[PDB]
Coordinates of C-alpha atoms and ligand atoms in Angstrom, one line a residue:
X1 CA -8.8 6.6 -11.0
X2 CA -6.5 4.9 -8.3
X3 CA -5.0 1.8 -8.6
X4 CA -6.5 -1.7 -8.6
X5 CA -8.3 -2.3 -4.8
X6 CA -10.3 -5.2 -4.2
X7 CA -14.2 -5.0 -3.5
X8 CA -14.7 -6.3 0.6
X9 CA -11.4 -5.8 2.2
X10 CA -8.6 -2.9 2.6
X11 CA -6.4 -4.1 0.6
X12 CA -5.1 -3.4 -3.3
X13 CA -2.9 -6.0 -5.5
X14 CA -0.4 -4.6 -8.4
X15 CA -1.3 -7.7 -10.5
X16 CA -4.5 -9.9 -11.1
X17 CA -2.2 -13.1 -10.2
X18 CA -1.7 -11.6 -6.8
X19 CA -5.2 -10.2 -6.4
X20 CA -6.6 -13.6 -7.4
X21 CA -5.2 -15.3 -4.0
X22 CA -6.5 -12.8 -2.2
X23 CA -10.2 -14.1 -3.4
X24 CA -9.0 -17.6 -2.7
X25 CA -7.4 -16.4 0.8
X26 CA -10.0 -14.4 1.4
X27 CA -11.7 -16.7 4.1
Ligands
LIG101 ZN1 -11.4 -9.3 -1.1

């Protein structure tokens, strides 16, 4: 399995605190 990536967007986040902005940046 590899690490944690998000689900529409390139990108991966090491911690759910981090990965949650990325929803709420998303756009
Ligand atoms: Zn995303």
């Amino acid at each position: 399995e590899k690490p944690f990536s998000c689900s529409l967007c390139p990108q991966r986040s090491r911690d759910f605190s981090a990965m949650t902005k990325h929803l709420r940046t998303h756009g």
